[PDB]
């Protein structure tokens, strides 16, 4: 027909090897920018003054790092929450010093990943599917917004966002424990149950479907060729798996509806992970984990320590050592 | 559509009550997190100046001013980690501010006792505390029963905003699926993908 | 926290394999449940879709073909073999926990992966060399000295205030 | 960086040897 429509039909085409779509129009360039900046910085970025104290932290392979110690380093505390595009710097040299690649990378990524989510909806609509896969992905997405966006906001600086690195991630976890007692927070307890329980049910669902595969092969061939793709029928006896697992425990602790069984597998880790990301997002505003320090005392008033008091000694050692040259006054209020 | 709208609004509300001390007066709601962090620096400038410190020339350990430094556009601001927070503006502090930021002459001469009081009150009421309402940092001992209304209101309204965004996606996608006629699953007799050419 | 400050357990390849196996299990769990729930066939005329499944039916209750296409085109690959997919689900988390179990046996012996020697040799000579690796070690030292007297009472650790390690102010 | 110099040969063979094993087995499947 006309140009705009031939292009609109190419964009929303269900015959492209990779679906594009309108979300895909924003997604592709922003992931490409984030990915290219990240690969170049990880390898070659010079040191970055993360805490605003003129104490640059080296994160790149060419400056003495390996895969496990390297990272793209958060922008400086002197910036705090100010926007810092390249064009705001007097030179790439200044920008590199003050941590600009980190801001470039996380905005293009957060943006491109939010459109990933919409793309999952978009292609399900062109395919005639039910639409809620994207809802599941929102649990990891939301977790990423937490450590890269929400937590910096509440604490007033992208310098306290999660670093883009293996060791940098551990750094962020430890400082989080000292400053918020995340282990004592119920939302993170909900997150562990989230992912332990997910892996559990993952091993269980697989183990129980693999246990009930229908003999379709001989002992010399992979069982896997007993299934052919798009075949009309099922390749395991669910009645048989219910009979096994219903007896492992008792009959009604066992699912016999395929649909109920899979919705359960979707919902458990999604919700848990919603809670732990909700928990990072509310500790962004210093609503922290339970505090039972010196909560038990005797007739006279002596402190009878509990395990919570031992945790606080750990927390305290992280507290006093982190960012060792960055505090001039006795409280660490952000 | 309305779930989408309300989500956006709870997020804005979240940020309003955390940063804004005009329609959320700190007289009523306690200090903002930046306000408390700034008030801590003021406290210890005052005390040390009383003892005899020349606070404008005090080099701290990093080479940055212990008490006063420049922001990245040059303004004079409180030192230490609160450098992230120099955008703070509050009626107890604006008095000491000149054209290039904090005025050292006003710091030396014009700090009233009401400001020393506000500044100490606000740093000891910083919006930090635990879920069972022990107030302070996480390593604090029980004693002080306090969690700032700013924390209670911003946390609760982020949670709500997030779950209403999830609401949007759930109901928006369902509403599209339903108006197209495949909200209840794929039609076995007409499975669209089967009329599609293979990707390879 | 003990394992962080004494063993540096986060830096350990065997825990990293376990972590990948657990978070990977949770990933497969969620994404397979959502794929089945969002490719289901219409097998009843009601809005609750759960009531359209009989355990004894022969037919697959969802479309493997359309699921595959979705993921081929969203992610570039998809599963095509339903047996392989469920075996992989048993495999990933089960193999993760086994790998973490191996690392702990090393910690029984204090055979930690605590350091990178090359980093220490440089940091010791070069006081401007700082990485996240060295920041994390300083945190460990803090954990050890602050928690041990009370974590290990039987040792009667006495640390005068002046030997406790601390940054400025805190 | 004063790294361990057998690290190169250890990484190299750690990659090469099992990768050659798989390639040997894939190509001789394709030709039957």
């Amino acid at each position: 027909a006309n140009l705009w429509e031939r292009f609109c039909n190419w964009v929303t085409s269900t015959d492209n090897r990779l679906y594009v779509g309108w979300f895909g129009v924003i997604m592709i360039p922003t992931l490409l920018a984030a990915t290219i900046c990240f690969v170049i910085a990880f390898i070659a970025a010079p040191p970055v003054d993360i805490d605003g104290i003129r104490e640059p932290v080296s994160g790149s392979l060419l400056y003495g790092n390996n895969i496990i110690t390297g990272a793209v380093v958060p922008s400086s505390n002197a910036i705090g929450l100010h926007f810092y595009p390249i064009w705001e710097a007097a030179s790439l040299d200044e920008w590199l010093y003050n941590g600009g690649p980190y801001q470039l990378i996380i905005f293009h990524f957060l943006l491109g990943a939010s459109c990933y989510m919409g793309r999952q909806w978009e292609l399900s609509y062109r395919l005639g599917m039910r639409p809620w896969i994207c809802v599941a992905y929102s649990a990891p997405l939301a977790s990423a917004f937490a450590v890269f966006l929400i937590y910096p906001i509440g604490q007033g600086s992208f310098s306290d966002g999660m670093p883009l690195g293996i060791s940098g991630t551990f750094n962020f976890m430890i400082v989080f424990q000292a400053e918020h007692n995340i282990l004592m927070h119920p939302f993170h307890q909900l997150g562990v149950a989230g992912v332990f329980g997910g892996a559990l049910f993952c091993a269980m669902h697989g183990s129980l479907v693999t246990s009930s595969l229908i003999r379709e092969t001989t002992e010399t061939e992979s069982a896997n060729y007993g299934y052919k793709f798009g075949q009309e029928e099922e390749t395991y006896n669910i009645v048989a798996a219910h009979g096994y697992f219903g007896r492992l425990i008792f009959q009604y602790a066992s699912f016999n509806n395929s649909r109920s069984l899979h919705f359960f597998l979707a919902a458990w880790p999604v919700v848990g992970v919603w809670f732990t990301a909700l928990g990072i997002s509310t500790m962004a505003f210093n609503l922290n984990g339970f505090n039972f320090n010196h909560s038990v005392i005797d007739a006279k008033g002596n402190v009878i320590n509990t395990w919570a008091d031992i945790i606080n000694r750990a927390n305290l050692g992280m507290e006093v050592m982190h960012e060792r040259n960055a505090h001039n006054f006795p409280l660490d209020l952000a | 559509y309305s779930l989408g709208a309300l989500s956006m609004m709870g997020f804005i509300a979240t940020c309003f009550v955390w940063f804004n001390n005009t329609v959320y007066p700190s007289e009523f709601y306690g200090p903002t997190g930046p306000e408390a962090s700034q008030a801590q620096a003021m406290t210890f400038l005052i005390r040390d100046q009383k003892l005899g410190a020349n606070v404008g020339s005090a080099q701290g350990p990093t080479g940055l001013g212990k008490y006063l430094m420049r922001s990245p556009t040059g303004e004079i601001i409180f030192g230490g980690e609160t450098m992230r927070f120099w955008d703070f503006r509050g009626p107890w502090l604006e008095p000491l501010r000149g054209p290039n930021g904090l005025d050292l002459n006003k710091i030396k001469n014009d700090i009233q006792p009401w400001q020393e009081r506000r500044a100490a009150e606000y740093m000891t009421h910083a919006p930090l505390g635990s879920l069972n309402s022990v107030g302070g940092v996480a390593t604090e001992i029980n004693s002080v029963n306090f969690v700032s209304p700013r924390s209670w209101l911003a946390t609760s309204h982020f949670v709500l905003a997030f779950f209403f965004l999830v609401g949007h996606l759930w109901h928006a996608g369902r509403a599209r699926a339903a108006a197209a006629g495949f909200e209840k699953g794929i039609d076995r007799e007409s499975e669209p993908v089967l009329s599609m050419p293979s990707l390879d | 926290l003990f394992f962080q400050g004494f063993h540096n357990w986060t830096l350990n390849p065997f825990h990293m394999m376990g972590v990948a196996g657990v978070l990977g299990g949770a990933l497969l769990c969620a994404i397979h449940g959502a794929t089945v729930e969002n490719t289901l066939f219409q097998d009843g005329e009601g809005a609750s879709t759960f009531r359209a499944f009989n355990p004894t039916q022969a037919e697959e209750t969802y479309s493997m073909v359309t699921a595959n296409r979705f993921w081929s085109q969203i992610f570039g690959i998809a599963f095509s073999n339903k047996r392989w997919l469920h075996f992989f689900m048993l495999f990933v988390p089960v193999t993760g926990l086994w790998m973490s179990a191996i690392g702990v046996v090393g910690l029984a012996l204090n055979l930690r992966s605590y350091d990178f020697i090359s980093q220490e040799i440089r940091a010791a000579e070069d006081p401007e060399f700082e990485t996240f690796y060295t920041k994390n070690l300083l945190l460990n030292e803090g954990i050890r000295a602050w928690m041990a007297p009370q974590d290990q009472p039987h040792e009667n650790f006495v640390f005068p205030e002046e030997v406790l390690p601390r940054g400025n102010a805190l | 960086m004063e790294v361990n110099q057998l690290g190169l040969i250890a990484t190299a063979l750690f990659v090469l040897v099992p990768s050659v094993f798989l390639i040997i087995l894939y190509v001789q499947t394709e030709s039957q």
Binding site: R17, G230 | - | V65 | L8
Partner: peptide, 30 residues
């Protein structure tokens, strides 16, 4: 030399992505 090794392995993995997507066994429907 160590940087070169880390980057080479990373580069090979990106190459493997490309072939695994674009040169996969094409799934078909018996």
């Amino acid at each position: 030399m160590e940087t070169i090794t880390y980057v080479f392995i990373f580069a090979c993995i990106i190459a493997l992505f490309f072939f695994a997507i674009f040169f996969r066994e094409p799934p078909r429907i018996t």
